[PDB]
C-alpha cells in the first residue's frame, strides 16, 4: 500500500475486504498457515463479490435438522453413509 495504493483500493472494491493490507498479507504467507488462520467475519456489502446459488444452499444447511427438503436434498453423502452401514465396516488394507 505504500507504493501501489491504487491497486489495493481496486482489489478492496472488488473483493470487499475491510482492510487494505489483506492482499499483501495473503500474498506473503504460506498456504497452510493461511488455511489455519482464516477466521474472517465481516465483509463489505458494497462490493462485486457475489453470493452464488450453491453457496446459499450450503449456508442454509450449515446447521439444519433432518427431513427438511433443502436439508435432505444436499445431505445425501451422510444418508449413503448411514444406509450402507459404513459406521461399523472393518478395515481391509
Amino acid at each position: 500500500p505504500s507504493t501501489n495504493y491504487e491497486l489495493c483500493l481496486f482489489l478492496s472494491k472488488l473483493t470487499g475486504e475491510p482492510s487494505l493490507n489483506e492482499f499483501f498479507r495473503v500474498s506473503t504467507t504460506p498456504l497452510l498457515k493461511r488455511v489455519i488462520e482464516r477466521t474472517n467475519g465481516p465483509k463489505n456489502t458494497d462490493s462485486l463479490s457475489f453470493k452464488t446459488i450453491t453457496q446459499e444452499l450450503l449456508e442454509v444447511t450449515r446447521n439444519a435438522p433432518s427431513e427438511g427438503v433443502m436439508a435432505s436434498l444436499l445431505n445425501v453423502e451422510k444418508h449413503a453413509y448411514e444406509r450402507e452401514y459404513l459406521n461399523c465396516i472393518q478395515r481391509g488394507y
Binding site: 435438522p65 453413509y81 452401514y85 459404513l86 459406521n87 465396516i89 481391509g92 488394507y93
Partner: protein
C-alpha cells in the same frame, strides 16, 4: 421418472423352461437372442462361473441394448449391473486399464451381514458435556420405555447426531447402533412449558412398550470398488462421489481380495457377481482389448456383456480391420449372441407397445401407416414420430391420433434418407468436405 426408450422392458419374458413368449414383459420377437440371454441370466444367478465374455451383435435398431436392459430388469435387486459405454474408459485422470479395473470391480458385489441393536424409546434426560472450544463431547442419555429405563454413555458421533434433529425430553426416538442413525419418531409428552424458539410441530406418538434393546441382523450389499476406494486413502468416502480415485495401487487390490476371501470364509460376508455391460464396445483401443483378455481370467471377474453394431471394421489403435471391430483373441474368449432384423408384425407390435407406454391412443390405420413407415425407413423413426403425432393430435383438440396427424408429423420431421436426398439435390447450399458453400441466393 420419465419415459425413456427402454421403459417398456420390465424383464426378459421367459418361462421356467427358459423359453421366450412371443410377447411378454415388453419384449416381442428375437426369440433365440432372448433364450440365450435367459441362459446368461441363469449363469449369473448361479454365481459359480466367473469371467465369461458375451458379445451381442446385430444391425442398428435391433435390440442389443434392449436385450441388455431386459437382462438388467430380470437380474433382480442387490445384484450389480454396471452399464457403461466405450467412451468412458478414455479419461484424463485414469489410465485405460485402471478405468477398466474400476468398471470390473464395480460389478462385483459383497453381501455383508451385520448385527444391530435397535433402541426405541422416550428420552427422559440428555446430559451433554462439551469442552470450551466444543471439540471433545461426551455425556449420558437416560432413555425409557414402559417396562424399564436405562442410562447410556454417548460418544462424539451420537451427540453430533443428537444435536441435529434436536431431541428434547419426552421425544420418542430410535437408535440404530451399527449405523449411528438417529430417527426422531416424534414427541409423546406435550409439556405445557413451550419455548418460543422452536417451530417444531412433531406428531403425537404412543409410548413404546416391550424391551428397549432389540437385536436384529441387517444385510447390505457393497461393491468391490467401494471397498478399494474406501481403503485407498483417508477420505475415500468423499472420493466415492467426487470420483477423485486416481490410480489405486495393486497392493490395495490384493489386500482387499484377501480380506474379502477371509470375510467369505468367516460367514460374515458373501460374494455375489454381476454384469458389466459395455455398449459400443468397438470404441475401445487395442490396449483395452488386451487388458480385457487378461482381466477376464480372474476369480473376481464378472460376466461381461458387450454390444456392437459394426461389421468387419477398423479396430481402434491398429491399422487393420477385424470382425465387430474386435481382435480375434478377444473373439476367441467370447460367445456371440446374434440378433436379427424384424418383419412387419414385430415392428407393429413394438410400435403398439411404445404407444401404450407413452399413453398415446392410435387408430388402426394410423398404426398401419406407422408400421409401413417403420419398415420403409426405421423403427426408431416411427417410434419418435409417435410422440410428435400425439402432440399434433392434442393441438387439434382430439384425444386419439389419426392418419393425418401421422402424415403431418412425417411431413414436418425428416428421416435419414429424405434428408440425404435433400442435401444431395441442394449440394451447393451446404458446407461440403472441402469447406465450400454458396450462401448467396443469386
Amino acid at each position: 421418472s420419465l419415459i425413456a426408450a427402454h421403459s417398456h422392458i420390465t424383464g426378459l419374458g421367459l418361462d421356467e423352461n427358459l423359453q421366450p413368449r412371443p410377447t411378454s414383459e415388453g419384449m416381442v420377437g428375437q426369440l433365440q437372442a432372448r433364450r440365450a440371454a435367459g441362459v446368461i441370466l441363469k449363469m449369473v444367478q448361479n454365481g459359480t462361473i466367473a469371467g465369461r465374455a458375451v458379445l451381442v451383435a446385430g444391425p442398428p435398431s435391433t435390440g442389443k441394448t434392449a436385450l441388455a436392459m431386459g437382462v438388467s430388469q430380470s437380474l433382480g435387486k442387490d445384484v450389480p449391473f454396471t452399464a457403461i459405454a466405450g467412451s468412458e474408459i478414455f479419461s484424463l485422470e485414469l489410465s485405460k486399464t485402471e478405468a477398466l479395473t474400476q468398471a470390473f470391480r464395480k460389478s462385483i458385489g459383497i453381501k455383508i451381514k451385520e448385527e444391530t441393536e435397535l433402541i426405541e424409546g422416550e428420552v427422559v434426560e440428555i446430559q451433554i458435556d462439551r469442552s470450551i472450544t466444543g471439540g471433545h463431547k461426551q455425556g449420558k442419555l437416560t432413555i425409557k420405555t414402559t417396562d424399564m429405563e436405562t442410562i447410556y454413555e454417548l460418544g462424539n458421533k451420537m451427540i453430533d447426531g443428537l444435536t441435529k434433529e434436536k431431541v428434547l425430553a419426552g421425544d420418542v426416538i430410535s437408535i440404530d447402533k451399527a449405523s449411528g442413525k438417529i430417527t426422531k419418531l416424534g414427541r409423546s409428552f406435550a409439556r405445557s412449558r413451550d419455548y418460543d424458539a422452536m417451530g417444531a410441530d412433531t406428531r403425537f406418538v404412543q409410548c413404546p412398550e416391550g424391551e428397549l434393546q432389540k437385536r436384529k441382523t441387517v444385510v447390505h450389499t457393497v461393491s468391490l470398488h467401494e471397498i478399494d476406494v474406501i481403503n485407498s486413502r483417508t477420505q475415500g468416502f468423499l472420493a466415492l462421489f467426487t470420483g477423485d480415485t486416481g490410480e489405486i495401487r495393486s497392493e490395495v487390490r490384493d489386500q482387499i481380495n484377501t480380506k474379502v476371501a477371509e470375510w467369505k470364509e468367516e460367514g460374515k460376508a458373501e460374494i455375489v457377481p454381476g454384469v458389466l455391460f459395455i455398449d459400443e464396445v468397438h470404441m475401445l483401443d487395442i490396449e483395452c482389448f488386451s487388458f480385457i483378455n487378461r482381466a477376464l481370467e480372474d476369480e473376481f471377474a464378472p460376466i461381461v456383456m458387450m454390444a456392437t453394431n459394426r461389421g468387419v471394421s477398423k479396430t481402434r489403435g491398429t491399422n487393420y480391420k477385424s470382425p465387430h471391430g474386435l481382435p480375434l483373441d478377444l473373439l476367441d474368449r467370447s460367445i456371440i449372441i446374434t440378433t436379427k432384423s424384424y418383419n412387419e408384425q414385430e415392428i407393429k407390435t413394438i410400435l403398439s407397445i411404445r404407444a401404450q407406454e407413452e399413453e398415446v391412443e392410435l387408430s388402426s390405420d394410423a398404426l398401419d401407416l406407422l408400421t409401413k413407415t417403420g419398415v420403409e425407413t426405421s423403427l426408431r423413426y416411427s417410434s419418435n414420430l409417435i410422440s410428435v403425432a400425439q402432440q399434433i393430435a392434442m393441438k387439434r383438440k382430439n384425444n386419439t391420433v389419426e392418419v393425418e396427424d401421422v402424415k403431418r408429423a412425417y411431413l414436418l420431421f425428416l428421416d435419414s434418407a429424405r434428408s440425404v436426398k435433400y442435401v444431395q439435390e441442394n449440394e451447393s447450399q451446404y458446407i461440403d468436405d472441402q469447406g465450400n458453400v454458396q450462401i448467396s441466393i443469386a
